[PDB]
Amino acid sequence: DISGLTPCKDSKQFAKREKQQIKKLESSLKLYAPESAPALALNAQIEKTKRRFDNYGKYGLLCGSDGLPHLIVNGDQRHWGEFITPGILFLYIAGWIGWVGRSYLIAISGEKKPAMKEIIIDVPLASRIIFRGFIWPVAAYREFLNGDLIAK
Amino acid sequence: NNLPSIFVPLVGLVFPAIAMASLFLHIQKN
Amino acid sequence: MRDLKTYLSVAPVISTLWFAALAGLLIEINRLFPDALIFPFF
Amino acid sequence: MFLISWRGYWQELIETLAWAHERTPLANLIRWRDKPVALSIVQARLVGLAHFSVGYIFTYAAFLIASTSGKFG
Amino acid sequence: SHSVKIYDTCIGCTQCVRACPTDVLEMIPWDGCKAKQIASAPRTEDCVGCKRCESACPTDFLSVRVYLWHETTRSMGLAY
Amino acid sequence: EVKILVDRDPIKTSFEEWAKPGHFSRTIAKGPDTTTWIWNLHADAHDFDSHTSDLEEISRKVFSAHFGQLSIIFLWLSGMYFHGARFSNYEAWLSDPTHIGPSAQVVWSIVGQEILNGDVGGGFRGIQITSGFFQIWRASGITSELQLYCTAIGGLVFAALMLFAGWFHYHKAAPKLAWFQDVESMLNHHLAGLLGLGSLSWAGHQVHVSLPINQFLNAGVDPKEIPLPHEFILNRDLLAQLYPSFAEGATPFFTLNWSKYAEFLTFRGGLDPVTGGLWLTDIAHHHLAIAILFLIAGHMYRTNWGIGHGIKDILEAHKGPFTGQGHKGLYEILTTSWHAQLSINLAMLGSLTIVVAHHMYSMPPYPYLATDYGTQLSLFTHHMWIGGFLIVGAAAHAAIFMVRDYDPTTRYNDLLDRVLRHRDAIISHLNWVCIFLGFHSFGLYIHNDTMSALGRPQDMFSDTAIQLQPVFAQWIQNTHALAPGTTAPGATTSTSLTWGGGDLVAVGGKVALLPIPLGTADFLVHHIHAFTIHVTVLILLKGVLFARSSRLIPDKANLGFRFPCDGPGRGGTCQVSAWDHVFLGLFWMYNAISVVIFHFSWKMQSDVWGSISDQGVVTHITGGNFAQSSITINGWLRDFLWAQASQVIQSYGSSLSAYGLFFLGAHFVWAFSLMFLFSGRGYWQELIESIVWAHNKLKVAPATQPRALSIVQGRAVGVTHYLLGGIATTWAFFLARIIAVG
Amino acid sequence: DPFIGSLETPVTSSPLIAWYLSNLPGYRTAVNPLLRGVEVGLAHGFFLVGPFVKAGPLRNTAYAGSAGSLAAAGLVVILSMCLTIYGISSFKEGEPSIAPSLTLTGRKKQPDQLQTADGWAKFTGGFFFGGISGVTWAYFLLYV
Amino acid sequence: TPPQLDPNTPSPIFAGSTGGLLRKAQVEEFYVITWNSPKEQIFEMPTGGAAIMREGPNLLKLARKEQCLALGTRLRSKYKITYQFYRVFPNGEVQYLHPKDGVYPEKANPGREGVGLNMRSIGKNVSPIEVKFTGKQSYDL
Ligand code: CLA
Ligand code: CLA
Ligand code: CLA
Ligand code: CLA
Ligand code: CLA
Ligand SMILES: CC1=C(/C=C/C(C)=C/C=C/C(C)=C/C=C/C=C(C)/C=C/C=C(C)/C=C/C2=C(C)CCCC2(C)C)C(C)(C)CCC1
Ligand SMILES: CC1=C(/C=C/C(C)=C/C=C/C(C)=C/C=C/C=C(C)/C=C/C=C(C)/C=C/C2=C(C)CCCC2(C)C)C(C)(C)CCC1
Ligand SMILES: CC1=C(C/C=C(\C)CCC[C@H](C)CCC[C@H](C)CCCC(C)C)C(=O)c2ccccc2C1=O
């Protein structure tokens, strides 16, 4: 479809790889007794492998010639969930962490010896500060508009 | 012919000794 | 009680508690959802 | 060797070696003209860098040429 | 022999004179400080370059400076 | 006189000192100005000699630290026993020890790491262990898991007891200084009580418990049918059926006709054919004799009574040709400072560990241990590394003592002054010996390589062209082989099968032991070992002797023990302290130990280990290529590093895959170490300046201003990373090879 | 003198060692350097002849010893060179001897002329002649 | 102050060592340190080992000035003893070295000439480009 790639449900090397993995698991599975716990664990492993391959086929990834899935970071609307959405989630989380840390630093900067507050954290103030990161983009945008973000 | 059998020993051994002696004498000279 | 609480707020103890909680949450999330390569909710 | 070990150890070793040379018989007749001292800091750094580069280049050249010429394909 | 220089930011705390291992620096009377004294380096030829005087000097930047220069038997610390 | 002296409640237990870090040192306790403070808080934590000056507090702190260490060790032992009891296949391995691989760890099933649960055997899946605990448990007579559970519970109880004892002896009743300074009573109690009584009790256990159970197991009885150990004590009929001598009771012992006990107290020697190990009767006899010897030797020093010897009198009254008055003030020096004792004990412990490794590999004392190759390799390498580290630490503590606890006015010794007055000759001679040994030992290899590379195999130093044979070692081997015939009539056979002469011992189709030949390669490797050891000794001795002062710096003792340099003057004075000498000798210890373990591994794989068919031929793992390929560096690189690394790099997708990952990870760490060994502080400080400016622009500047690491800290980090990476690489390679091929 | 960087030991100060070292040709001060150098060269060449013929590349063939002998002679030549330059860079034409002037007891004695341009030149010439003669004698004795 | 002389002072009791004088002392120079002790006591030599100083005047020979100054400062710090050292040349010249004015350098003394003083801040030095192609240096100006 894109750059000469084949949909992963159509490709045959994907099914071949699944067959090799299942055969490799069954080779070790044949050793133990049917009622033994290792047999149950290996059967669970086989079921997990089958479910993983079924989900990979369902999600619409594109395996290459070698039979392994490939990721598209172009921004094509058909492949937004591979890169763009996790990227947005990661950016949100990182902004939360950074905003919380900067807010705590500014809050403890007032005291006479902030070093003792850094080496020995105070819990109530940090607990109050932490939950303000849920709205970090709005606060950051407003502070940038006002002019409090950059020191002078 | 047989030039290498005459030239390789000259460059390999005699010339380095001459150069080393000359350089040592020039360096140690006051 | 005051001194014990002050000691419990030192950097290594808080760090190990935070990282243990984070590791436990990540392990439990990966157990409930075994494999994940793309974001399929949308 | 030139990139981790530093000067003071070698200077003390050189002093001990000088004492040993001075005290022995039948070899104190021969005496030096320039006092032996250990290498400087920048000089040792340069020597170590030169050794590192020479080893790097020679090893890679040998490996590349041998591997590419053994098969000729 | 290395070069040792003294600037006028000195406050005459006499730490550099005490730190010297070869008796290079001394103190002389002066006029532009509370301590009414300033350091000097007459015996420059005996300097080895240990830079202990710079190690013991309270200022924004050192009021005593050592620049390495032509080496000899004394400055190389040789006893043989 | 000898008395118990204590002080009541010297310190009060409270949490107020936990809140404020660095309470031991006032400079640290003042507060953090920069980040370097943190790096100091961990460096001076255990330097009790710098916190105060009174010996009493230091001794009390040392005692409490010892108690805490004992508690930690007991916790570790209890954990090992509990793992053996719960998650293991010990009962399955007991019946068929040859065809089942020990395993005592089970991995969870979270991510996909379940591939690490390999098919060890006996209907079990897990990680194969190489600690050798199964052989110890079998030799102790354990045949169930309830006993292991009870042992784990007892270990937990003892760890709790040790922790409580430490708390009690620091905070409730702390001994005075005179209690610690009584070395005669301590020596008497450590010799007669700690060593003799413990070995006597272990010999009694072996006589009463281990021997009958092991005899029943060796007969072929099922482990579930063996009578319980207390049945042998309760029922004298069973022991009479097993060993008739017990029917006579303890009467022979008092009757002095001890020959009646010849059934279970023998002097045969050699290896047991069934299990490939030493006889248990010989072990019990040896323990009994050692107990007698220690009990006799524990009554030498005078304590509280007329009879005995005085250590000070023995030292002072010593007269000899080369010594003279000699040891006059050594007693005060040894009873005044802890560092000299620490150095002596560290060196002795390292030497003992090396001897232990050698004696353990040579004569296997546990059943079914020789035929398990991974356990042998792991034990040898581990004990060698531990011994090397201890030997290195001894010199560092000796230098610390010489720097900070030596004064020739109050406590003067003649021998130390005499040694300190001629250090130049010692250093010069050691340097010459090192140069000569290195030149010859490495020039032989370089000559062999050059002659082989030029198509001249008849000019090398080999068994075929120019022979350099170890005649003295061969003579010693022949003497040892012929020893039991005439020189030792009591022993039936020789002590070990290593000596050239005797028969081959193999257990379960696998070779256990056979005589080891000696040739030119052994000569070369032994000389290389000597060269490396001599260089390490030279480095450590030069560090120790020149600690107080030197020709270059006449007042090095004023600067202390841990200082980076003196300055850029005098041409450069970097790395002049004894700490730098220890940091430099660590590398050479690492090199020597690596060479030794490589030699041991290749020689054992090539000339001893292997398999035997029914006809009677022996096929070794590498087919005896050591004698012709180990004489050149190219042979070492190709036939050892390249050939034996096939298993580790091909372990992906199998149960050994973890090892392969480590084989990469350690490599990374090694390279990382170089960053801390080739650079300096100024560049990093100047970079941190710009980083701090970039932080300041956004109002995220911390109060604790970041600072680059100190020079000593950087050197320590570099050497630690280097050693860790190298050791982990060797560990992964050895374990992967010996598990996949053996 | 306890403040001089040297110690007195049985090995370094014994009548036998002192006599044996003082009777060596390198310590005879009164004798002119040529006669000492001749003996030194003779001994050195006679010693040096052996290892070349015993461990040479051709040591197994029939030419072996002869070839080895030649090699020994070559070494002597190189050694002679290593002497000559050492004189040129050390002793000037008109400067006097630099040997110690007084003995251990304290008596004034004539300094050795070996540490002089003419003395060192005589020593080197005698060493070369003696080395060549010793090599020739060793070869003749070994293979005739 | 007028320089003193050291005609015939005895020496401490030492057994000898290998850290003593070398060929430089016979060729180039050496140093002599003299002090006065009120009682016989044991001290530590800079060259390794311990020695005993006789009661009265004591004299010692060393190779460098650093050893002399270290020994003198140890004597002053521990024993409270006045000392002075000279430098001796092969030709026989003896040059007075330690305190030249008769007082220790750490004490300000009138009549002392100042050497190496620059009446400016360390940041007022000119750039190296200004002193190029000349034999002077920026810090010398
Ligand atoms: C750069 C050029 C170079 C050359 C051309 C040679 C050439 C030679 N080498 Mg040398 N060598 C060199 C560099 C060189 N080397 C270096 C860098 C090293 C250090 C690794 C060595 C170390 C070395 C060793 C360790 C040995 C040689 C030997 C040999 C000889 C081998 C031939 C033979 O089989 O023996 C034929 C038989 C002979 C003994 C020849 C005898 C006649 C010779 C040429 C002497 C003539 C005398 C003359 C007065 C020399 C002094 C004059 C002065 C200007 C040099 C030959 C003379 C072998 C040898 O000489 O044996 C002792 C040998 O064992 N070489
Ligand atoms: C470091 C040790 C080392 C040693 C011992 C040897 C030894 C040997 N080499 Mg090898 N070699 C080496 C390293 C070494 N090599 C290296 C690093 C290289 C470069 C890669 C080579 C390259 C090389 C070549 C190219 C050749 C050899 C060959 C040989 C042989 C020639 C010997 C000879 O002719 O000169 C011996 C000369 C002497 C003057 C001996 C001096 C030593 C004497 C005996 C001193 C003993 C001191 C005594 C105890 C003093 C006490 C005093 C008391 C009496 C008062 C010899 C067996 C040659 C060969 O063909 O052999 C088969 C050859 O051609 N070698
Ligand atoms: C015969 C009795 C006796 C015994 C058995 C021991 C045994 C021991 N002592 Mg010694 N000691 C004794 C007499 C004795 N001591 C006397 C009289 C003195 C005073 C001069 C000392 C002074 C002394 C010091 C200063 C130190 C030791 C240490 C040690 C331990 C060494 C650690 C080790 O090697 O692991 C072997 C491990 C085991 C065998 C653990 C078993 C637990 C043992 C059996 C505890 C019972 C021992 C105790 C003496 C008896 C209890 C008395 C109390 C209930 C009233 C070990 C527990 C060192 C130590 O580690 O400190 C804790 C230490 O620092 N001892
Ligand atoms: C037998 C026990 C023993 C004991 C009780 C001591 C005791 C002492 N040592 Mg000695 N020492 C020993 C053995 C011992 N040493 C050995 C074997 C060596 C050779 C390496 C040394 C070498 C040595 C040096 C070089 C120094 C001392 C010093 C000291 C003192 C300071 C201790 C300190 O602050 O550490 C507190 C603890 C640490 C700083 C922890 C550091 C982190 C380590 C290095 C990491 C190991 C990592 C681990 C194994 C790998 C897993 C990684 C994982 C964590 C991710 C203390 C009195 C120091 C001193 O100042 O003396 C006056 C000093 O400079 N020792
Ligand atoms: C593999 C590289 C390497 C090598 C070869 C050396 C070599 C040496 N080290 Mg160094 N060192 C290294 C890395 C290395 N080091 C590293 C990584 C460190 C950590 C910082 C150190 C730290 C260190 C310390 C702390 C010490 C040394 C010392 C020594 C010397 C030991 C004495 C001896 O064996 O000399 C014999 C010679 C050799 C083994 C070198 C190879 C020579 C071969 C045989 C070739 C000879 C051929 C021939 C003569 C060449 C002529 C050809 C030419 C004419 C063209 C020797 C010079 C010790 C010392 O100097 O005391 C004596 C010492 O104390 N080293
Ligand atoms: C393993 C282990 C354990 C255990 C242990 C045990 C169980 C022990 C035991 C022990 C014991 C159980 C001991 C015992 C001992 C004994 C003894 C030491 C005895 C002695 C005796 C005597 C000395 C005698 C004498 C006599 C004589 C000579 C004659 C007559 C008289 C009389 C009898 C007096 C635990 C858990 C803890 C920990 C972990 C590990
Ligand atoms: C090497 C090592 C190890 C091991 C160790 C061990 C194994 C030990 C053991 C030990 C022991 C094994 C000990 C023992 C002890 C004992 C004792 C201490 C005893 C005592 C006794 C008594 C006290 C008695 C008493 C009595 C009685 C009861 C009766 C009669 C009378 C009388 C009084 C005699 C480990 C692994 C940890 C690691 C590290 C190192
Ligand atoms: C890399 C390097 C540095 C820089 C190394 C530094 C600054 C060490 C940094 C250590 C850590 C990563 C810093 C942060 C530590 C905090 C605990 C972080 C807390 C925040 C979360 C991670 C919990 C030197 O300072 C140096 C000095 C002398 C010789 C060589 C070197 C050298 O090689």
Residue numbers in the entry:
A (entry chain F): 68 to 219
B (entry chain I): 5 to 34
C (entry chain J): 1 to 42
D (entry chain B): 662 to 734
E (entry chain C): 2 to 81
F (entry chain A): 9 to 750
G (entry chain L): 130 to 273
H (entry chain D): 64 to 204
Question: What does the primary publication say about this deposited structure?
Answer:
PSs share a common structure that includes a core complex housing the reaction centers (RC) where charge separation reactions occur and an antenna system (Light Harvesting Complexes (LHC) enhancing the light‐absorbing cross‐section of the complexes (Pan et al., 2020)). The red‐most PSI absorption arises from special Chl pairs that absorb at lower energies than RC P700, referred to as ‘red Chl forms’ or simply ‘red forms’ (RF; Croce & Van Amerongen, 2013). In higher plants, LHCI binds the PSI core complex as functional heterodimers: Lhca1‐Lhca4 and Lhca2‐Lhca3, both of which exhibit similar spectral properties and emit far‐red fluorescence at c. We obtained two high‐resolution structures of the PSI‐LHCI supercomplexes from A. thaliana wild‐type (WT) and the a603‐NH mutant genotype, which lacks RF.
The structure of the individual subunits and the positioning of the chromophores within the AtPSI‐LHCI WT supercomplex were very similar to those observed in other land plants (Qin et al., 2015; Mazor et al., 2017; Iwai et al., 2024; Nelson, 2024). Structural models of PSI‐LHCI reveal a chromophore cluster comprising three Chls – Chl a603, Chl a609, and Chl a615 – and two xanthophylls (Xan) – violaxanthin (Vio) in site L2 and a lutein (Lut; Qin et al., 2015). Notably, Chl a615 is present only in the Lhca3 and Lhca4 subunits – the red‐shifted subunits – while it is absent in all other LHC proteins, regardless of whether they serve PSI or PSII. Chl a615 was coordinated by His168 and His151 from helix C in Lhca3 and Lhca4, respectively. An additional Xan molecule (Lut) was located close to Chl a615 in Lhca4 only, as previously observed also in the pea PSI‐LHCI structure (Qin et al., 2015). The Lut was situated at the interface between Lhca1 and Lhca4, in contact with both subunits, and one of its hydroxyl groups formed a hydrogen bond with the carbonyl oxygen of Ser210 in Lhca1. Notably, the EC value between Chl a615 and Chl a609 was 79 cm−1 for Lhca3, whereas it dropped to 19 cm−1 in Lhca4 due to the differing orientation of the chlorin ring in relation to Chl a609. The pattern from the WT yielded both monomers and dimers of Lhcas, while only monomers were observed in both Chl a615 mutant lines. It is worth noting that Chl a615 was localized at the interface between Lhca subunits in both Lhca2‐Lhca3 and Lhca1‐Lhca4 subunits, consistent with the hypothesis of its role in the stabilization of LHCI dimers and the binding to PSI core complex. Furthermore, while the EC values between the Chl pairs were in the limited range of 87 cm−1 and 101 cm−1 for all Lhca, the EC values for the WT Chl a603–Vio L2 coupling were significantly higher for Lhca3 and Lhca4 than for Lhca1 and Lhca2, which do not show red‐shifted absorption. We can therefore conclude that the lowest exciton state of WT Lhca4, responsible for the red forms, is a mixture of exciton and CT states, with a larger component of the a603 → a609 CT.
